[PDB]
């Protein structure tokens, strides 16, 4: 989780999400990484779920970084209502993530550690991902 505590617009329109990551597939941080495969929102609930499952499995572990950040307002209408009359509610605080975007990375772990960890952490999220090392990513800032 995490988000602004006071931004600019309570509500904002859904939008269209096709692809291209916009920017963010290299590193400069971790030594292993987890990268998305589909153009969807990732919910901060799921995000912190991953953060958990991660630091959870590997206790006393080093530092993990989240390149993403859940800053998209979901419009959730009250339950059992009728059409029109308004909109949703500032629920589902999430982020816009497209394939090829490094959601999150580990550094200081172990090989199989980072493996199983990021493996499960990714298995949590509403998609599927790529577990990546660090070599080609070099340069691009």
């Amino acid at each position: 989780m995490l988000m602004p505590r006071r931004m600019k617009y309570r509500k904002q329109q859904r939008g269209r999400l096709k692809g291209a990551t916009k920017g963010g597939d290299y590193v400069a941080f971790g030594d292993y990484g987890l990268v998305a495969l589909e153009p969807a929102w990732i919910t901060a609930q799921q995000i912190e779920a991953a953060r958990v499952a991660m630091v959870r499995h590997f206790r006393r572990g080093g530092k993990i970084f989240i390149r993403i950040f859940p800053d998209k307002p979901y419009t959730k209408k009250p339950l059992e209502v009728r059409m029109g009359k308004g909109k949703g509610n500032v629920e589902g605080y999430v982020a816009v993530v497209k394939p090829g975007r490094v959601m999150f990375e580990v550094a200081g772990v172990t090989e199989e550690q980072a493996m199983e960890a990021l493996r499960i952490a990714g298995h949590k999220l509403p998609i599927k991902t790529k577990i990546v090392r660090r070599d080609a990513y070099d340069e691009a800032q």
Binding site: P78, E80, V81, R82, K85, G86
Partner: protein
């Protein structure tokens, strides 16, 4: 069915869009009293027989044809030059 407490709004209010834009360009004869630039701030500064009014609007003073100009450390220019 059961439809409990819902609500309302406050935003069903819009400003009547007023047709704004530039009407005449280089290549068109404009003869004395023809508006050719609708704007709010100085998007287009007047000049050579060009005119401005009480609301930043460019028009024709002569029976001349429009043309443009760029002067960075001054602004954007329109010059409606006629014939010798």
């Amino acid at each position: 069915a059961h439809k409990k407490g819902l609500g309302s709004t406050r935003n069903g209010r819009d400003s009547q869009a007023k047709r704004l834009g530039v009407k005449r360009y280089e290549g068109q004869v404009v003869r004395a009293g023809n508006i050719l630039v609708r704007q709010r701030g100085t998007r287009f500064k007047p000049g050579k027989n060009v005119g401005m009014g009480r609301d930043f609007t460019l028009f024709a003073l002569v029976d001349g044809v429009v043309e443009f100009q760029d002067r960075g450390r001054l602004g954007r220019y329109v010059h409606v030059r006629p014939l010798a």
